[PDB]
Each structure stands twice: as C-alpha cells, then as structure tokens.
Amino acid sequence: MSESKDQLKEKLKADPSFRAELKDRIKNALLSKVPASVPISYNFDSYMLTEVQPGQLRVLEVDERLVLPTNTLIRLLVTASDVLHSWAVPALGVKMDAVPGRLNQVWMSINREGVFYGQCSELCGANHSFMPIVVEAISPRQFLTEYVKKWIS
Amino acid sequence: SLTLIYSLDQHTERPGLTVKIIGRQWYWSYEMHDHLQHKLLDPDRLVGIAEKALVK
Amino acid sequence: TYRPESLSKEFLEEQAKIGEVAQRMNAPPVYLNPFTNRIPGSILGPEDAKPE
Amino acid sequence: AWKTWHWNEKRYIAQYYADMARREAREDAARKSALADKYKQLEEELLS
C-alpha cells in the first residue's frame, strides 16, 4: 500500500541488481519525455540583387543565402531543370555541373565560418552573368538550435 | 595528383546534412528534407541523481 | 550606356568606411579573406572583436 | 624563393587554425561548466 512502496525503496537500498533494474526503468521513463523527431524542410529560391548598398558586392550578392554548419560532413546533390549550370564556390573548392536528369553528389566540410561567394560556371543563356552563389557558414550548435527552428511547421 | 583525385569522396563519417541544389534560368534553388531528433546529454548522471533522489 | 552606382565616389567612401566586412543574417559579421589581410584566428569579425 | 613564400603562407594558416581551436576550446569548457552548475542546482532541487 504505502509500506510496500517503502519496502520497494528498502529493496532499492538492499539489492544492487534491483537498484540497477529500477535505474534502467528510470532511464526508460526519461526517454519517454524526450520530444519526438520532427522534419526540417524548406524550398526557397536565390536571386541576384539588382541594386546593392555599401557592404554588399555588385553582381555577386543574392537575396537568399545557403546556410551551412561548420565541422560537419555535408552532402550536396546538384541538378538542373532546363539547361546546364555549374555550381561554383571558389573559396570552398567545389565546382560541379548541374545536369538535367543527373544527381551529382559532393561531400563537403567547412573549416571556418564566413560568407563565401560564387557564380555559375556553365554557359546557359543571355543572363549567364547574373546567377551568383552565396554560402553563409555558421557554427553547428547555432545551426541546430536556432536556424533549424525557422523551418519547423 | 592521383592521390588528390581519390580523396574527393569523403564519406567515411556520419553525414549530417543534405542540400539539393537546382539550377534554373536564371536563379538557384535550395532544398532540404531531414529529421531533427533530440538525445539526453549524458543521461547516466541524471540516472544517478534520480537514484539518490529515490534512495532517500 | 550604364555606369553602375557602386563605382561612384560616395559609394566608394561608404564602402571604404566598412572595409572587407560581410554581414550575416544568423550570426555576427565576419572579416572577408582572413589570410591575405592577416586577421588572427581568435578574431572572427569586427563586432565580436570589441577592442580593449 | 617561390616555395619559401608558399611555406610562409602555410605557416600563417596553420597558426590561424591553431588560434581558432584555442578560442573554440574556451566556449565549450564554459558551456559544460554552466551545465554542471545547472546540475548542481537540480541536485539541491530534488534534495530540499
């Protein structure tokens, strides 16, 4: 009743195996309070800025950047929709063509935080000059505690 | 140079992010669909704390 | 037929005031090209420097 | 002379990344210190 609860606590005091089993039960119950897995998902476009302010670079500046954590193995799947394009970031040593129907993978890991610029490096029309690339790199704890909370529905 | 070529695949770790890059006329598109899960950080200290909370 | 507005002298003076500093929308700003401008590895950006 | 300049630049890069690791080891020690402080608070929270 209540003494049997107290007798269970006395058996916790006495038997080490029962103590370990109830510790494992405590660990099972604490994992039940852990929130479940949630999906992170986004789909945005990145366009060149037509007019820039001081502190921004003409031709190379976009409106929406790609935010990537540092010290993390990142897979980049590159493809296209209509013609050939090339995703080139010269500071990160990645330049791989975007082919319609292909899914070209890149393994990338960034050493330091910063803002890295790029352009498209495959001729694709009249406005080939005006498809720039900007990658913003932040720390992994910021990425996993603040940035991914912007994409929880 | 051959050694640098064969080092371009670096899949010897647990991958942490996937980003789908799509090239259009004339702009870029970025996609992601992953899952965020949480894990109790060093639970055995909490296990012992609960153990000494229940023993008295 | 088109001389861009980032080459005018007012833009150039306001850019020279900022320097080679890139803003970030999720983090404090960062110095661009930290090796050729010899920023030390303890300093990441101007706002995070906070000079003594 | 060219390889001397290259080795000089690589030396600066190695010192840069060493300083960055020295800095990055400092916040993560203070983070675990704050975690231990919260653990010491939760310890007396279940004993009072």
Binding site: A91 | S1, L8 | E20, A22 | -
Partner: peptide, 28 residues
C-alpha cells in the same frame, strides 16, 4: 571568400580540399 582588386593568385580557402588543390598547383 571574395576576389580582391589587382589579385594575382587564388582566393583564401575554407576547406582542406581547396587548400590541397592550391598546394598541388604551387608544387607544379
């Protein structure tokens, strides 16, 4: 990270692979 006026060589790097490429180029 970004190109600079009157620049001769490559840009600065943030991956070990890009640094290794530049090292190979200087060796050649």
């Amino acid at each position: 990270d970004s190109p600079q006026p009157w620049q001769l060589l490559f840009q600065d790097t943030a991956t070990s692979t890009a640094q290794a490429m530049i090292d190979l180029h200087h060796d050649i």
